[PDB]
Amino acid sequence: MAKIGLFFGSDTGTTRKIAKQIKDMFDDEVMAKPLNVNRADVADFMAYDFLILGTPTLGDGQLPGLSANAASESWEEFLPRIADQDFSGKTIALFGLGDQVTYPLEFVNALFFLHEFFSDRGANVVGRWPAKGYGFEDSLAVVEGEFLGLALDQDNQAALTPERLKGWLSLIAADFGLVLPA
Ligand SMILES: Cc1cc2nc3c(=O)[nH]c(=O)nc-3n(C[C@H](O)[C@H](O)[C@H](O)COP(=O)(O)O)c2cc1C
Numbered sequence: 001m002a003k004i005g006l007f008f009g010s011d012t013g014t015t016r017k018i019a020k021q022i023k024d025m026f027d028d029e030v031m032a033k034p035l036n037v038n039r040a041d042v043a044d045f046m047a048y049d050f051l052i053l054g055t056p057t058l059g060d061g062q063l064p065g066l067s068a069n070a071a072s073e074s075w076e077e078f079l080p081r082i083a084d085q086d087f088s089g090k091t092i093a094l095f096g097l098g099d100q101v102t103y104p105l106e107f108v109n110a111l112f113f114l115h116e117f118f119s120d121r122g123a124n125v126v127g128r129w130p131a132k133g134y135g136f137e138d139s140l141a142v143v144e145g146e147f148l149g150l151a152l153d154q155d156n157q158a159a160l161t162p163e164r165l166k167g168w169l170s171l172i173a174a175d176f177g178l179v180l181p182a
Pocket of ligand 1: 009010011012013014015016056057058059060061062097098099100103106107108109154155
């Protein structure tokens with residue numbers, strides 16, 4: 001019913017809180033309430049033509065899920081449920097949570113798997129983010145000096161999250177038809 005679907009994966013609530021912060025900025029007409037992918041219905045997920053998806057990186061640079069030692073199923077188990085769906089015509093923006101100090105070689109790698117998955121199915125992906133403001137040495141989520149989606153780090157750069165969400169949401173505002181609060 002809402003224009004933008006908002007889904008996330010999360011083990012310790014960090015990504016969930018961010019998803020909520022994002023929703024707090026827009027009206028029910030433009031964006032739906034944040035929902036954990038382990039609660040989502042395929043038909044419910046497939047209805048939106050615009051999607052904002054968030055995910056942390058766990059285990060060993062993996063998507064959250066039971067194989068990554070998450071307390072509950074997450075993106076890992078959800079993707080197969082929609083692997084046969086076509087995402088052509090759908091606009092998707094990704095945000096990832098990670099810890100650049102503790103995992104300098106796999107910073108927000110989960111973003112790559114998410115991007116690859118929807119990209120391989122015709123989705124229009126937007127929201128690349130400059131990688132200069134981060135300290136890391138390697139990442140599957142970096143292409144041409146930019147992260148495949150917004151990168152957030154509540155472990156080391158929590159103070160930067162507000163300006164990053166304002167700036168990033170403004171970046172995908174054109175594609176998504178969003179209007180940021182003053
Ligand atoms: C066992 C474990 C592994 C992690 N692996 C990575 C990693 O590979 N890359 C990364 O950027 N962050 C990694 N992190 C950091 C988390 O993604 C980060 O703390 C995030 O904020 C957690 O999100 P959540 O609270 O939504 O689960 C790891 C954290 C833990 C506890």
